[PDB]
Write a protein that binds this ligand. Structure first.
Ligand SMILES: Nc1nc2c(ncn2[C@@H]2C[C@@H](COCCP(=O)(O)O)N(C(=O)CCP(=O)(O)O)C2)c(=O)[nH]1
Ligand SMILES: Nc1nc2c(ncn2[C@@H]2C[C@@H](COCCP(=O)(O)O)N(C(=O)CCP(=O)(O)O)C2)c(=O)[nH]1
Ligand SMILES: Nc1nc2c(ncn2[C@@H]2C[C@@H](COCCP(=O)(O)O)N(C(=O)CCP(=O)(O)O)C2)c(=O)[nH]1
Ligand SMILES: Nc1nc2c(ncn2[C@@H]2C[C@@H](COCCP(=O)(O)O)N(C(=O)CCP(=O)(O)O)C2)c(=O)[nH]1
Ligand SMILES: [Mg+2]
Ligand SMILES: [Mg+2]
Ligand SMILES: [Mg+2]
Ligand SMILES: [Mg+2]
Ligand SMILES: [Mg+2]
Ligand SMILES: [Mg+2]
Ligand SMILES: [Mg+2]
Ligand SMILES: [Mg+2]
Lengths: 204, 206, 206, 206
């Protein structure tokens, strides 16, 4: 199916001075990699693709924190827009989980017999998603799909690819739009690349 | 300031004046606080948060699940301030569920709060007992400061008298849903704050 | 009939909202918050598409007061049309009404309206005289249909009885500014609709 | 100064199936050239640049219809957002004009521009001859300053040498539509900037 918006390995990105950038990170980012408004435009379209394939039965939206919170909130807002401007709509429930083994959610028995949409910020090797999916399938959901904002082109991939992708990106470390570098850079609406100064100041 | 005061005799708006998810058509009586009104109030709240807390690294604490919309929209408005001004501060986020010492579920170690400007984000304050006990727990990790932003505060004689630092709307003692406030997990997928209908209370009764 | 706002409606305190500093002392109350304007306009866009979405739409913006409603109304119409399975193209036009009965300045040859679904977008209907007259001028070129969306309709004893087809809000006979509604060319740069204070009315009096 | 966002001559664009596109233009478009969200992000930064240079005196924002209305609306929305989330801000008035094949159609009296800070807002500069002509008329009325913002500037050898003060994007010498930019009045109702396809150039040709 669709592999998303392909960002080539040689993408230059954009000069920071062409966009509005948080003052505290000005010296800490290299380039803007994916502008926030382009994330919205892509997400809008994924929202329609999601409803096409899953609007026929109750959806349980499952946000993988922390990185996924922003993508999850905006994906859901566009899905909500679809549901209030059209005759066809089905209820949605939401839940949140963090991965260490699953940390702090509803009991997974809520997923049984439901359309489960797992929402992720990034897929790298895909090992984590494979592991979460084999766990979720033990609870017998009607169906389980994975929406991920980014998929990284990496040789370390184990072969997993999600059902809805936003962008496919080089094997580069990106921050922003809730993706972090040691907890920092979540408070940034663009996806960006850290500068050298940057990763020093916030090294662990 | 108690925020935007909605009075006990406010009728709210007929469902037909607004766009409503069709599957909740029968289950809501009135729209209580339209989404765009929530946005406008949150915009102001974002400015008051930065004026008081912008001096030092903020840790924003979302109280799941009901707080997640208010949290994302408040942080969105704070982000918009920080990329359009000459002074801002880094801000990290964490998410927690709450169930005597209050049981905090998930979350980083609370030592991550030591010495930070901590902001707790809540969907609604009712008796105040939950924030009072969470505050009592957080102060023991020695934050620089700790403050609470709540979209909604209920006027109730059952209040233990706790007032949060930032409040969107002060509302009557009525059960409201929407904007991530649920009735048995339903109605989170609704952008307006609304009052639950009678058919809908029975239809979704646990 | 649209969102009805009553005579004794208080409005909202300026300090609960974000307000441009240069107008802080010039307004008495926020009358209709921006975000509430948007919520109603989303719904109106759906009515428009249902009634006129079957044939080419020509949307006519009545400058200057209409430009803000017009832009937002059309943006919610575009949002429907890239998320439906059957949409229709729309073209746009802009006009100003000058006396000496009504002169249509700017805008295309009215022959372009023949056979089209014509939507006239207006900021406020006061007496209804302007709209009645423009309608009679447009019906002369034989549009497939002509409809009026007005953001505001005033309640008045001096109304000549014209009623638009789509109404945002029905309001008292107060003097409101904001959201592109002006006083002596001022207050167009303000997202909320507000009532003008006495200080402000003197400060900008022509 | 900022030459704006430089879109190369070889830029491939994006496939239409990766974005939400109006149904009725499905076949009429080749690629998305500049997504609506990119335009927004860039405009947000032009609003800060505009304010930093013109924000010390009453601004008259002059929208050149019809192509400029979208960019005008969004630029002024980002400017308003700055003015209500900072301590100090300056008032702003708006006028609209249309050009005919040299002749300024509509608009207030050009004397309303004397001593003002005039911001002319344009969708596209190509040769620049029209902007030079417009400036030559505005300058007869002695503005305090006059500046031009253009969403798009074409890299063309046919350029007469004129450069605007604020530029969103520097684009190839090729024909784009959307975001109010039209082809025989069509494609204005589209939020992305895009390249017309063959079916489309033929379907709406003059
Ligand atoms: N910011 C950023 N993170 C990247 C990037 N590449 C890989 N990662 C990892 C990806 C994710 C989890 O890994 C599963 C992937 P897998 O498919 O390989 O198993 N991480 C977490 O820290 C989770 C905790 P959170 O932050 O959500 O609280 C960092 C990148 O380019 N940028
Ligand atoms: N939807 C809605 N809930 C209301 C309303 N009144 C009171 N509540 C409570 C508020 C909260 C508990 O907090 C007590 C705070 P208190 O200590 O100050 O009394 N609840 C939860 O279910 C938390 C789990 P969540 O849903 O977040 O996952 C229900 C109302 O009108 N509407
Ligand atoms: N701001 C504001 N104006 C009000 C209010 N009440 C009445 N008006 C009038 C209404 C409008 C003309 O409309 C008459 C339609 P009528 O024939 O039905 O009475 N005006 C214009 O100045 C048009 C030129 P513009 O401003 O678009 O360039 C002012 C109010 O409360 N607030
Ligand atoms: N859509 C689109 N138009 C382009 C493109 N290249 C040039 N044009 C022209 C540009 C403009 C006039 O401006 C002259 C600029 P110049 O003097 O600097 O050479 N036009 C109008 O039709 C104005 C009436 P409007 O439609 O606004 O009411 C079309 C392009 O790529 N796409
Ligand atoms: Mg993740
Ligand atoms: Mg991480
Ligand atoms: Mg709560
Ligand atoms: Mg609850
Ligand atoms: Mg008018
Ligand atoms: Mg007027
Ligand atoms: Mg032009
Ligand atoms: Mg043209």
């Amino acid at each position: 199916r669709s592999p998303g918006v392909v960002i080539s390995d040689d993408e230059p990105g954009y000069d920071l001075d062409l966009f509005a950038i948080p003052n505290h990170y000005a010296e800490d980012l290299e380039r803007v990699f994916i502008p926030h408004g382009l994330i919205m435009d892509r997400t809008e379209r994924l929202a329609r693709d999601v409803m096409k394939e899953m609007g026929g039965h109750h959806i349980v939206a499952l946000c993988v924190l922390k990185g996924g919170y922003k993508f999850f909130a905006d994906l859901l807002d566009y899905i909500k827009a679809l549901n209030r401007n059209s005759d066809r709509s089905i209820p949605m429930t939401v839940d949140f989980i963090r991965l260490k083994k699953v940390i702090g959610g509803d009991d997974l028995s809520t997923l049984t017999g439901k359309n489960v949409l797992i929402v992720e910020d990034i897929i790298d090797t895909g090992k984590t998603m494979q592991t979460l999916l084999s766990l979720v399938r033990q609870y017998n959901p009607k169906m389980v799909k994975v929406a991920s904002l980014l998929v990284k082109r990496t040789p370390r991939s184990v072969g997993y690819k999600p059902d809805f992708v936003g962008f496919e990106i080089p094997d580069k470390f990106v921050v922003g739009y809730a993706l972090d570098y040691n907890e920092y850079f979540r408070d940034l609406n663009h996806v960006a690349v850290i500068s050298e100064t940057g990763k020093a100041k916030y090294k662990a």
